[PDB]
Structure formats: C-alpha cells, structure tokens
Structure 1
Amino acid sequence: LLNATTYRDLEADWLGHVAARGLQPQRLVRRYRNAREADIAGVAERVFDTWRNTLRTTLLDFAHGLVACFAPGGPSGPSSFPKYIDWLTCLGLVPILRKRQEGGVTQGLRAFLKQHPLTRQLATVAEAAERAGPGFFELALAFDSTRVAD
C-alpha cells in the first residue's frame, strides 16, 4: 500500500488543503505583519503537523481495513498453517490440492474496495489502491486456490 504513493498527488492534496484553509504564506504574512521568525515558523510547522497526523491515521485505518480481509482465512479453511506444521512434524511431507476458483476472500475484497469513501476523499489513497489492486486480487486468488489435505 505505501509503496504506491507518489509525490505529485500528495503535494497537490496538500496545496488543496492549504487553499481550503486560506492560509497561504502571502496572506499569512500580510496578516501577521511582524518579523518574529520563530513564532511564524512554528505556526506553519504546526499547521503542517496537524495535516500530517490526520493523513497518518487515515492511512492506518485504510491499511487495517485492507488487512482484515486476509487474516481470518489463513489459519483455518483452505491453506491452513497449523495443518502444514503438523504435517511437517509428523512426516515431513505436505500433500497439497489445487483448484483455480474464486472464493470468500475475493468477494470480500470486491465488496470492500469498490465502495470505500476514503478513495473518493483522497486522490493519493485512491491512486495507490488502484495501482496496488491487482496484486491484492492475485494474493487473494492464491489464498483461495490451495488447500492442504486432511
């Protein structure tokens, strides 16, 4: 998720937020009308910091939402880990059965991504999601297809 971000769209969103706040450097300096560099620099830094914190928590929430689809289906159902480990401990062999089909993970991903408000809210989040999307679907198909035997 984080590798797909780009500098241009993030800068564009930051500039859009600045325009929405009406706190451009020209207006801010023309309003303050003082030479106290430390105070104005701290004000600008905190203005940026609030946006940085909000972006970080938004990305955290989206990342947890994406993670929530895969995790339950790992230890149980198709492609279970403890069954793999006890196969290794008993014999060292791991029989595996394969079939190419769509399952709960793929439908969960489809029902999750297609109607998430954060994509419409932020350009960077939407572009990162659409760029990294195919990998998520391929990983979901990989999770669904395999099944360690009983």
Structure 2
Amino acid sequence: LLNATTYRDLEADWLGHVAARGLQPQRLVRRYRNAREADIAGVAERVFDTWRNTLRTTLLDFAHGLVACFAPGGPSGPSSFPKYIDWLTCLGLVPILRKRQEGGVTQGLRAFLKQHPLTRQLATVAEAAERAGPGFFELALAFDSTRVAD
C-alpha cells in the first residue's frame, strides 16, 4: 500500500489543505508583520505536524481495514497453516489440491474496496488503492484456490 503512493498527488493534497485553511505563507507573514522567523517557522512546523499525524492515522485505519479480509483464511479453511505444519511433522509430505474459482476472500475484497470512502476523500489513496488492487485480487485468488488435504 505505501509503495503505491507518489509525490505529486501528495504535494497537491498538502497544497489543498493549506488553501482550505487559507493559511498561505504570504498571508500569514502579512498577518503577523514581524521578523521573528523562529516563531513563524515553529508555527508552520506545527501545522505540518498536525497534517502529518492525521495522514498517518488515516492510512493506518485504511491499512487495518484491508488486512482483516485475508487474516481469517490463514488459520482455518483452505490452505490452513497448522495442518501444513502437522503434515510436515508427521511425514515431510504435504498433499495439495487445486481448483480455480472465486470464493469468500475475493468477495470480501470486492465489497470492501468499492465502498470505501477514503478513495474519494484523498487522491493519493485513490491512486494507491487502484494500483495495489490487482495484486490484492491475485493474492486473494491464491488464498481461495488451494486446499490442503485432510
């Protein structure tokens, strides 16, 4: 998810935030009208810190939203991991069975992504999700297709 992002959209979003506040450098310096550069620099730094923290928490929330779809498939259902480990511990073999089809994980991914609002809210997240989506769908198909025999 993080790797998908790009600089231009992030800069555009930061500029949009500044414009929405109306707190542009020229207006702020014209407002204060003093040469105490350290104070204005600290004010700007704290503004950017607020924006950065909000972005961090937003992205964390979305990322946790994505992870929940895959996690339940690992421990149980097709491709269960403890079954693999006990297969290894008993014989060293691991019989597998395969069919290509779309199942629960792909449906969950499809439902989650098309509804989520952060895609509309942030262009950066929109592009990142659009780029990362296909890989998520391939990985979900990988989860759903394979089964470890009983």
Question: Per the shorter chain, which TM-score range?
Answer: over 0.9
SS at 1:106's partner residue? helix
The 5 Å alignment of 1:110-129 reads 110-129=110-129
Deviations 1:9-44 (A, max 9, x none): 000000000000000000000000000011100000
* 1:81 aligned residue: 81
Please report the RMSD computed on the Cα atoms of aligned residues, expressed in angstroms. 0.3
How far 1:53 sits from its partner (Å)? 0.1
SS at 1:63's partner residue? helix
| Residues in 2 aligned to 1:138 and 1:78: alpha-carbon distance in whole angstroms | 16
Deviations 1:53-76 (A, max 9, x none): 000000000000000000011110
SS at 1:147's partner residue? strand
Identical pairs, percent:
100
TM-score (norm 2): 0.99
Deviations 1:78-106 (A, max 9, x none): 00000000000000000000000000000
| Residues in 2 aligned to 1:75 and 1:115: alpha-carbon distance in whole angstroms | 27
* 1:35 aligned residue: 35
How far 1:120 sits from its partner (Å)? 0.4
| Residues in 2 aligned to 1:143 and 1:30: alpha-carbon distance in whole angstroms | 59
SS at 1:102's partner residue? coil
| Residues in 1 aligned to 2:75 and 2:146: alpha-carbon distance in whole angstroms | 13
| Residues in 2 aligned to 1:73 and 1:32: alpha-carbon distance in whole angstroms | 58
Extract unaligned runs of 5+ from structure 1: none
How far 1:46 sits from its partner (Å)? 0.2
TM-score (norm 1): 0.99
How far 1:137 sits from its partner (Å)? 0.1
SS at 1:31's partner residue? helix
SS at 2:115's partner residue? coil
SS at 2:97's partner residue? strand
How far 1:8 sits from its partner (Å)? 0.1
| Residues in 2 aligned to 1:120 and 1:139: alpha-carbon distance in whole angstroms | 25
Extract unaligned runs of 5+ from structure 2: none
